[PDB]
Amino acid sequence: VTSVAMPSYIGSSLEFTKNNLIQIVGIKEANIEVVEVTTAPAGSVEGMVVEQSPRAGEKVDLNKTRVKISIYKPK
């Protein structure tokens, strides 16, 4: 079975998170969706990962899972 635990990316930059998934975890670029969210916990920095699917430590299948990364982009 080619399923690993999802790293915790909350608080990291999008660039780090995307390239970690691709180069270290082995997720295909096609299976990463980036969404911008307008709200985030207090202290969040614009551009930072504030939510992720799968959640930290949950199963991610290297070929099946559609990874979703939410980035804080306030108005």
Curated annotation (Swiss-Prot):
Residues 1-73 form the PASTA domain. Consists of an N-terminal kinase domain, a transmembrane domain, and a C-terminal domain containing four repeats of the PASTA signature sequence (Penicillin-binding protein and Ser/Thr protein kinase associated domain). The PASTA domain binds to peptidoglycan (PGN) subunits (shown in strain Rx / Cp1015), is essential for StkP activation and substrate phosphorylation, and is required for cellular targeting to midcell. The chain holds residues 579 to 653 of 659 of the full protein. Belongs to the protein kinase superfamily. Ser/Thr protein kinase family. Autophosphorylation occurs predominantly at the threonine residue and weakly at the serine residue. Dephosphorylated by PhpP. Homodimer. StkP forms dimers through its transmembrane and extracellular domains. Dimer formation likely promotes autophosphorylation activity and might be necessary for targeting StkP substrate. Interacts with MreC in the elongasome. May interact with sensor histidine kinase WalK, thereby playing a role in signal transduction by WalK. Protein kinase involved in signal transduction pathways that regulate various cellular processes. Likely senses intracellular peptidoglycan subunits present in the cell division septa of actively growing cells; thus, intracellular unlinked peptidoglycan may serve as the signal molecules that trigger StkP phosphorylation activity on a set of substrates. Plays a crucial role in the regulation of cell shape and cell division of S.pneumoniae through control of at least DivIVA activity. Disruption phenotype: According to PubMed:22211696, cells lacking this gene show round shape (the cell shape of wild-type strain is ovoid) and form long chains with unsplit cross-wall joining cells. Their septa either are not positioned at the equator, or display an aberrant ultrastructure (curly aspects). They display delocalized sites of peptidoglycan synthesis. According to PubMed:22431591, cells in which StkP is depleted clearly show an elongated phenotype, with cell-wall synthesis occurring along the peripheral side between the septal zones. Reduces transcription of the peptidoglycan hydrolase pcsB gene. The gene is stkP. It comes from the Bacteria. This is Serine/threonine-protein kinase StkP. It is found in: Cell membrane.
